[PDB]
Write a structure and sequence with these properties.
By secondary structure, the protein is mainly beta. The chain has a single domain (2-196), classed as Immunoglobulin-like, CATH 2.60.40. It has one helix at 184-196; strands spanning 16-18, 30-33, 38-41, 47-52, 62-69, 101-103, 110-113, 120-125, 136-142, 157-164, 170-180. Bound molecules: 3-azanylpyrazine-2,6-dicarbonitrile (2 copies) and zinc ion. Residues 84-85, 88-89 line the site of one 3-azanylpyrazine-2,6-dicarbonitrile (YM0). Belongs to the p53 family.
Length: 197
C-alpha cells in the first residue's frame, strides 16, 4: 500500500496547523504537547484542530485527514479501527464503521476508502473562520484506543492533514502524532518528563 508523504509543506497559501493551550489536568479530554508534537485524547471526544493560511484559498478547497503508522516497519499497513470497535453500534450515519478518524459537526464531511491503497480518510470543505476568529477549526474524533489489539496495538500513529484543491491536488500538508488513551493529561505529563531525561 502506497505510503503517503508526511513531509510538511506550507505551499502557496502558507498552510499550517495550530492547537490552543489546554493543560494536563485530570478532567482534560484532549491535550496537545508542543514538545512532542503529539495530541493526547480520549476515545470519541472532540479534538479541535486550528487551521491557518496566510491567504484565502479558492472556493472548493478541501481539508483531508488521514492516519498512518509512525514507525517505518508499519507505515505500509493501513490504520483502521480494531475488530472490536468496528462492530460497535456507533456510526453517526456518515462515518463508515471501520474509520478511525471522524469529523464532528459537519454534514459536508465525506469519507473515502481509497480503491488502490485501501487507506481511510475524511475530507471537508475548507471554510473561512467563523465570526470573530482568526482560525478555521475542524473538530475530529478518534474512535479506537492506541492500545487496542488487532488495531493500532500500541503502535504510534501520525495524523496527516492535507489542504487540497477541488480535484484533490496537494496545496499543503502538516501533521502531528496522536495517542488515544483514557487519561490523556497523565500520559502527556509522563511522556514530557521522559523527553526531559
Ligand atoms: C462497541 N460498542 C459497544 N456497544 C460495546 C459494548 N458493550 N463495546 C464496543 C467495543 N469495543
Ligand atoms: C479554508 N478555506 C477558506 N475559505 C479559508 C478562509 N478564509 N481558510 C481555510 C483554511 N484553513
Ligand atoms: Zn479499538
Amino acid at each position: 500500500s502506497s505510503v503517503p508523504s508526511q513531509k510538511t509543506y506550507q505551499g502557496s497559501y502558507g498552510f499550517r496547523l495550530g492547537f490552543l493551550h489546554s493543560g494536563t489536568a485530570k478532567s482534560v479530554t484532549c491535550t496537545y504537547s508542543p514538545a512532542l508534537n503529539k495530541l493526547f485524547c480520549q476515545l470519541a471526544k472532540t479534538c479541535p484542530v486550528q487551521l491557518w493560511v496566510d491567504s484565502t484559498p479558492p472556493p472548493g478547497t478541501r481539508v483531508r485527514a488521514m492516519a498512518i503508522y509512525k514507525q517505518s516497519q508499519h507505515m505500509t499497513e493501513v490504520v483502521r479501527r480494531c475488530p472490536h470497535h468496528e462492530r460497535c453500534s456507533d456510526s453517526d450515519g456518515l462515518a463508515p464503521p471501520q474509520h478511525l478518524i471522524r469529523v464532528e459537526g459537519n454534514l459536508r464531511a465525506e469519507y473515502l476508502d481509497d480503491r488502490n491503497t485501501f487507506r481511510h480518510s475524511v475530507v471537508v470543505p475548507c471554510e473561512p473562520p467563523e465570526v470573530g476568529s482568526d482560525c478555521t477549526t475542524i473538530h475530529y474524533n478518534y474512535m479506537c484506543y492506541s492500545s487496542c489489539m488487532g488495531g493500532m496495538n500500541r503502535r504510534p500513529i501520525l495524523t496527516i492533514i492535507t489542504l487540497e484543491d477541488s480535484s484533490g491536488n496537494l496545496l499543503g500538508r502538516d501533521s502531528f502524532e496522536v495517542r488515544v488513551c483514557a487519561c490523556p493529561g497523565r500520559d502527556r505529563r509522563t511522556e514530557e518528563e521522559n523527553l526531559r531525561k
